[PDB]
Amino acid sequence: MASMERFLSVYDEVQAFLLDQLQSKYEIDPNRARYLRIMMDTTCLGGKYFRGMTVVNVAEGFLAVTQHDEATKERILHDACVGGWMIEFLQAHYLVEDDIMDGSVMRRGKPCWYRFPGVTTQCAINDGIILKSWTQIMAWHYFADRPFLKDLLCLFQKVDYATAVGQMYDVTSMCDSNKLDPEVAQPMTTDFAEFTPAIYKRIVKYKTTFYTYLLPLVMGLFVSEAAASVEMNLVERVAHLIGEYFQVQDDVMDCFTPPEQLGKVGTDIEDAKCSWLAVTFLGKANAAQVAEFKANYGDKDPAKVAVVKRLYSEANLQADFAAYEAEVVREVESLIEQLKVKSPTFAESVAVVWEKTHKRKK
């Protein structure tokens, strides 16, 4: 709570930097400054700050065991905060744009940015472009003479790219691969042959895990100058594991958590998404269940949607989930043990990240 207020005081400094630079260098007028301040506030705040706060917890962990001057402590914490906000702004970018592509209605308990009456798709698209440019403006401003600058940019960009590739895997997950063709309007799949665990796994590996887990963790290492002190293949394997589970939870909540609690309203059934629920159901259903799933999936019709939920409850998926969670707890503990060998501190940081995720309710 106190630490989160400190993370937010760094948001305020960053907002101030960005907005004063708009006035001093980009000829902005007060009203457009205001619009951009409100956009930044609306798209970047109100979340859990899980990605940002991870950078900071990684850095705090190394600080407890590493000798530094006070001044250097303070710089390290401040950089971890800036780094954290780069990742939040990056997420803010993805969500503004994602909400347009998913035809979404609510986000963090409010309308999606593009649905604000004075915004619309026309302004929102470019607003999301601005959120991303801001990540880079921050990096070059606050990290210009840090040793980790080049490594951080290069990583940030590879993570952004994988994420965008992931979003392509996601937005085309309901069409048949052999039919993808810019020239031909795309029909929803009728056989659901590509609703498989491996295909699902590729969607999720790219669209969520790099930017939600790999980036904040390695970012925490960069600003700590601690990345040579870990086994990177382990960091990857653990980001990919927890990241996958994180997205599985997102999928279950889309169907089962009231929006009242969730803060977004779920579109996966209507959007015909290759979600965990749809893949898992099709891996256990009998012939008649499959036939009725195929009869109602991917239509915006309330009673079709309700038939899918019923088939999901009947297949007892909220116990396939428990079985999957159980295999994940196993594998995460095992990876944490393997990380303990070169860095107890980073292993603990990961234990904390796993814990925050496992207990997640939104």
Ligand X SMILES: C=C(C)CCOP(=O)(O)OP(=O)(O)O
Q: Which residues are annotated as a binding site for Mg(2+)?
A: 98, 102, 170, 250, 254, 268
Phi, psi angle pair for 106, to nearest 5°: -130, 150
Q: Is 168 left (phi over 0), alpha (psi -120 to 50) or beta?
A: alpha
Determine contact, residues 255/312, Cβ cutoff 8 Å: yes
DSSP-based three-state secondary structure for 286:
coil
Contact residue for Mg ion among 60, 102, 127, 194 (CB under 5 A): 102
H helices of the chain, where?
A: 2-25, 30-44, 50-64, 70-101, 120-143, 149-171, 197-204, 215-224, 232-256, 259-262, 276-281, 287-296, 302-314, 317-340, 344-358
Nearest residue to Mg ion, by Cβ distance, number only: 102
Q: Which is nearer to ligand X, 73 or 362 (CB)?
A: 362
- Which member of 15, 43, 54, 91 binds ligand X (CB under 6 A)? 91
The three-class DSSP label of residue 153 is helix
Interaction between residue 259 and ligand X (CB under 6 A): no
Residue 111 interacts with which of a second copy, Mg ion, ligand X, none, CB < 5 to 8 Å by class: none
Least distance (Å) between residue 230 CB and ligand P2H: 25
What residue numbers does the annotated binding site cover?
A: 98, 102, 170, 250, 254, 268
Q: Indicate whether 51 belongs to the interface with ligand P2H (CB under 6 A).
A: no
User: Torsions phi, psi of 257, nearest 5?
Assistant: -90, 125
Residue 205 within binding range of ligand P2H, rule CB under 6 A: no
Task: Supply the minimum distance, in Å, between the C-beta of residue 194 and ligand P2H.
Answer: 17
| Token output for 297 | 């999936």
Residue 46 contacts residue 110 (beta carbons within 8 Å): yes
CA 158 – CA 161 distance, rounded (Å): 5
Contact residue for ligand X among 22, 47, 289, 325 (CB under 6 A): 47
Out of 32, 34, 48, 150, name the contact with ligand X by CB under 6 A: 48
Q: Which residues within the stretch 195-254 sit at the binding site for Mg ion (CB under 5 A)?
A: 250, 254
**Between residue 235 and residue 274, which ones bind ligand P2H under the rule CB under 6 A?**
250, 264
Residue 270 near which of a second copy, Mg ion, ligand X, none (CB within 5-8 Å, type-dependent): none
Rule CB under 6 A: say whether 50 interacts with ligand X: yes
